[PDB]
């Protein structure tokens, strides 16, 4: 589960302005915080889903709230994270046969088991964190 | 049905490790003696299945109690023979069957293409990083 | 779908806690803000998976986070909204086979037997107890 | 896993002899200490399988080596511990179905992927456990 921070700004007469730090040029807005985070959260999928389709390669690094917090350009913004999972992101996953090692398996059924996750789940972020 | 001979011996305040005479590579341990010998009982079985799994032969003559009790570097020891029944054992990884997101299934078959690499071992070591890196 | 806000703030040093609005009694923490929005999403998820296993009805109507940004006891909080899927859910506890001695099987059955317990609540009980020993 | 200390005695005009802290009454020997072990195994497994059959109730108090080394009674002892299983016991278990929440499911399969354990196996020595 990738989190990314967003910063939400609000004055009197205007709505909700968000900004994306990790991703400079994504700029959304709602009505009210709720609809700012969600549609920020359709732009953040939309952004990464149309590079995928361009066959871009995309590189999921996520800044944390705690390293932006006291930088000047968000002072005042209120700070929310926006969780992308990657079956968020492919609608049609293939399905392969592979072989694992059992000791690897142990460990990841251990982890897993806590976290409602699945070996598939588990392998593919392990897969594409291994890529950069 | 190998006997495998392990030793445990008290290291510092309650730590008490464990020797394996014939798998010398295994450092166990326990807060607890009983701790020790459970955790090194794990360490063997997970030794011995993982070798079988690549297909090596694992079938030698482990040593006894008797030709250690006395040597000078088991003074003191507590003993306990860990049986290993090798009869289940598979001799190849097991196989499974997962789901990938199509575009991550690319840049994997796409790198181990070049390395000439496994997408099985490729997942497997890339398993064994993101388990580390958590901690 | 079910939206729940929850609300991250900074209680001590290097600790986040969270507060759920829509439930109260979770409390849940994490030596940073995405491990606590990590382990809040998971207590929320068992918390509302359970129920729903026990045959409650939970769809009710989840808080805004509009609604509770500007009061004083969040001030300074960040927040995410945890989205929980009911579709899934079952309404009824998992159905296992289990082997066990017949010697343990029955001093179980015939425990139960008089307190008006079930195998099952019994065993459920009895594996939380075992599992209260962490290290 | 149940881990009975044993207490082995050696002298030369004689043969190895055994005690067993937690089943006074078991007194067992070998030409070599291998040999006196698994003949110790031997007489434990035999009692506690006895008295099931008897119809008695067994409660599994194991002594530990770390209290019991240091009494006169055992000075110059080389001690060694026994391990049975339940498994070891009943050759015949009956397979039942039952009902687990899911909560409690997920803990016991994180706790036994790392101990070559099982639900089954889990929950029978829960059962013994939490039966006092
Ligand atoms: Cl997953
Ligand atoms: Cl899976
Ligand atoms: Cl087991
Ligand atoms: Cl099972």
Redesign the interface.
Request: net charge neutral; charged share 30%.
């Given at each position: 589960?990738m989190?990314f921070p967003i910063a939400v700004h609000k004055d009197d007469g205007s709505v909700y302005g968000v900004t994306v730090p990790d991703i400079p040029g994504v700029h959304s807005w709602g009505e009210?915080?709720?609809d700012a985070?969600?549609n920020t959260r359709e732009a953040i999928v939309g952004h990464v889903e149309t590079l995928?389709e361009l066959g871009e390669?995309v590189e999921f690094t996520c800044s944390?709230?705690?390293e932006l917090v006291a930088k000047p350009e968000y002072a005042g913004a209120?700070?929310?994270?926006?969780?992308v999972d990657?079956?968020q992101?492919?609608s049609?996953?293939?399905?392969?046969?592979?072989?694992?090692?059992?000791?690897?398996?142990?460990?990841?059924?251990?982890?897993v088991?806590?976290?409602?996750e699945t070996?598939?789940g588990?392998?593919?972020?392990?897969?594409?964190?291994?890529?950069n």
């Open positions: 589960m989190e009210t915080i709720d985070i969600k995928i390669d944390t709230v705690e209120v700070w929310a994270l926006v969780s990657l079956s992101l492919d049609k996953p293939e399905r392969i046969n592979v072989s694992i090692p059992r000791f690897v398996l142990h460990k990841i059924d251990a982890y088991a806590s976290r409602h070996r598939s588990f392998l593919a972020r392990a897969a594409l964190e291994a890529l």
